[PDB]
Design a protein around this nucleic acid. Structure first.
Lengths: 92, 78, 97, 104, 99, 84, 94, 108
DNA sequence: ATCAATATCCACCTGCAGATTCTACCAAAAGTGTATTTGGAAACTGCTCCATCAAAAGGCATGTTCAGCTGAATTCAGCTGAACATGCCTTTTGATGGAGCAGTTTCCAAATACACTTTTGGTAGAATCTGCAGGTGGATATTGAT
DNA sequence: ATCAATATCCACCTGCAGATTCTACCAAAAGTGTATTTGGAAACTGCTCCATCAAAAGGCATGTTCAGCTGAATTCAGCTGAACATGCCTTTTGATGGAGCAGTTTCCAAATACACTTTTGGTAGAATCTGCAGGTGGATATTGAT
């Protein structure tokens, strides 16, 4: 079994555009995009923990890495979304 | 086989790159540049193929070769 | 006998191919090229056809982008004609040379 | 009931956790890290799909295709910079003719 | 005479002189002030190891020198000898700095 | 505690001239100097932005050489000689 | 105390092997330390990716070799492969 | 108890095989590390060091100096095609540039 | 631009087939509970090195004057590259065989992990050694003539 | 058109800041013993890639005509380089207060570990829906002639 983000991309698409669809090639693009940004964020957070002699990647490393990788307003909204989702997850 | 990259294919590429007028020397020059590019990308791709002990260059081998050359390509596995 | 003036068909072609996304090199001659170059490393390698297609997308996107830079170099020299020297400047500044 | 639903997200928090755990990134992965990373990935995906669906409705399509993704990426300053070294296959280029090349 | 070199002669001499050497070409205290001003607008009350200021200055000078080389080639390309803003812009656009 | 402003003008016309010389330039338009100050301010802002992000993440108040080296490397401008 | 490790002594040893009457300034030694750390991280991270791509949990000399072949520009690669192979076999002969 | 031999002496190396092994093992490159990986890696790092130091020492001799400085490292890196490619995105602090004046700028 | 004639572009349909969803099953993954261990935050502090201030000198920025020569603009033609007709052929489309290559599946020797103990190689700091910065001022090369 | 003026080259010399050597303590390799993990050898498939081959669709090669672009030539205003005086402000060397970097200690909130238990996403046929073929012909744009 080979996994991908297809179903998740699809669900986000039905959030932001309920009537719009997406072709198979376009979903391959989106999948590559998710994989790309994942490896960028993770590998930057890994370097961040190394430089600071910590064995753990926490949301603090993910947030700093987002601040180094995304350009300006994308970074600000991404930090907002990550903080929101963590706060809503801890509450349970 | 390089000459199979024809003058009109090269014109088509230049048109998409917005070029309106083209010197007669460009085609040969283009064929040189293309050749170097391909030799680089296939070289490393083959190297991934060889490390995996395969003899089928896969799409992912190409993706990795393009990536370590700073030329990330979407739609083929990453 | 009706004739378009020089450049008019060229502008027409720019509009068409900038609106489109199809590959502009024919499949078989490029697959032949890929297999020759590759054979210059280990003969009789197989290729997944999606691997040949990945190579082609990479190659055409690279040549198209290079032609956009070459075009800016030609225009910088008060010209509308791309010349090998424009390709050369573009690649030197890109760090390809 | 899953962590994704718990955090308000469509992207899979569990999968993202397993992928950090197994990616040779660090010895340990904190509990908030994959929640936060999944949220970031969902957000960027929504931005892209928002713009690409917009571009597909301005060309009056109902199916997003790679071309709409390229139009969405390149016409948006921050996304174009974030993805400045990315080739989208079958994406083409923006229509763009240098003014000096036009007639008259 | 009164002796006077022709325009260009003293600049060619200066190219040879500075391409032979490696000293920082920007005054040190003003560059440090620049670094502290920029950094303080991002987080008040940073200090700097002086090592960090010299690393910033090496990086900046090597960047400007490299860009000026590329700018020079752009000027030569348009059959000029004098670099102009449009040459810097062409260079930075082709580098992908601001395409 | 005194106020830092306008320090981009410490990058003078003569210093810019020297840098162009090292870069091979023989003749310089009068508009180059403000252009160069703009390009340098942007470059140095980007580098320092990231170096301070590393400084903050480490809960320090002192930018180290290593923070600067990490920022330069993140941005494709690896610098040798300042790792100690 | 504050003990700081570094490649300086090994760089210096190699210096004495290739030029026995030549020294090196501390700034030049900092360049060489930077270089060693840099090439190290490129090879180790490419080898990590190689093990990960093929679903292996171990970095071996094979991953190091193919990383060297992907990273080094040609004759450098060839001679680096020779020295690495030589040292490995010499090592395994105890 | 057997006499101790460093892994470096065993591999015939000057670079530190055991330090390379620990750095591999604590770098989060992979769960485990093969015995021969730090030897090969240390070998390659020593070889590249020898190459650079060879060319930079020649450049110091040419400049009538006995101490290598960053300028000598720059001269060697940029005058060598393969080193210049390998280090194509690196700044050598205090390195300077190579003497180069475009033909069209020389007096006519 | 006015205008008629000519050529290509393109909004507009309508079906059908090729993709995109329903139906449905199931291992692998995700979650939940419990038992543990532990990395890193808090607190506390020595002591490196950072910020700041000053003097004194003299390097280098600044501001001016002026004309050499460069960029800009213009004119013109030689010749190169666009457009086109024509007629040939390469590539597309697609079908057929079948080999051999990926790609899982266990079994297990061989390799790597990891704690404890012992044995140096490597670092810090002190002590010693020594290029060469940086000051000489002739020796030679280049420049730009009146 | 040798000659004056200027700059660079190159060799000299010696103290001292910086480099090299040495020395002793100790962190961390190395050895040793044992537990755990793994990746290859043998084996069993079944997608999947190449080697054929052919008909006709388009797309390319070639040769001619000429529009118009590139490049040479020429002119000239005025910007930018070169050379000067002045004196600011950087550099240097130095001394000093103290921020905070870093080195250590305790000890829990937050992590890993392991056993079960549900859930889900992948998968793949079958059943039901946008998008390309591709008709157009009808605008839209271009062109030579006034």
């Amino acid at each position: 079994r080979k996994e991908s983000y297809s179903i998740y991309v699809y669900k986000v698409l039905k959030q932001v555009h309920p009537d719009t669809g997406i072709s198979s090639k376009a979903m391959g693009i989106m999948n590559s995009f998710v994989n790309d940004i994942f490896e960028r964020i993770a590998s930057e957070a890994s370097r961040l923990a190394h430089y600071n002699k910590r064995s753990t990647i926490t949301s603090r490393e993910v947030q700093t890495a987002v601040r180094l990788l995304l350009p300006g307003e994308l970074a600000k909204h991404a930090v907002s979304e990550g903080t929101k989702a963590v706060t809503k997850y801890t509450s349970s | 086989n390089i000459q199979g990259i024809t003058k009109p294919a090269i014109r088509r590429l230049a048109r998409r790159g917005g070029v309106k007028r083209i010197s007669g020397l460009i085609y040969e020059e283009t064929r040189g540049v293309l050749k170097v590019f391909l030799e680089n990308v296939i070289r490393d791709a083959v190297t991934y193929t060889e490390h995996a002990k395969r003899k089928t260059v896969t799409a992912m081998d190409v993706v990795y070769a393009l990536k370590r050359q700073g030329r990330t390509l979407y739609g083929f596995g990453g | 006998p009706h004739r378009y003036r020089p450049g008019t068909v060229a502008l027409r072609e720019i509009r068409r191919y900038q609106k489109s996304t199809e590959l502009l090199i024919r499949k078989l001659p490029f697959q032949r090229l890929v297999r020759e170059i590759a054979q210059d490393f280990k003969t009789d390698l197989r290729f997944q056809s999606s691997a040949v297609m990945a190579l082609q997308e990479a190659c055409e996107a690279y040549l198209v982008g290079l032609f956009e830079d070459t075009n800016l170099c030609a225009i910088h020299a008060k010209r509308v004609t791309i010349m090998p020297k424009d390709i050369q400047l573009a690649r030197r500044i890109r760090g390809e040379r | 009931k899953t962590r994704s639903s718990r955090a308000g997200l469509q992207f899979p928090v569990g999968r993202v956790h397993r992928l950090l755990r197994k990616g040779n990134y660090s010895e340990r992965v904190g509990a908030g890290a994959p929640v936060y990373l999944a949220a970031v990935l969902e957000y960027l995906t929504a931005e892209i799909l928002e713009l690409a669906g917009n571009a597909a409705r301005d060309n009056k399509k109902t199916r997003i295709i790679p071309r709409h993704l390229q139009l969405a990426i390149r016409n948006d300053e921050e996304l174009n910079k974030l993805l400045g070294r990315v080739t989208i296959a079958q994406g083409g280029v923006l229509p763009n003719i240098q003014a000096v090349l036009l007639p008259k």
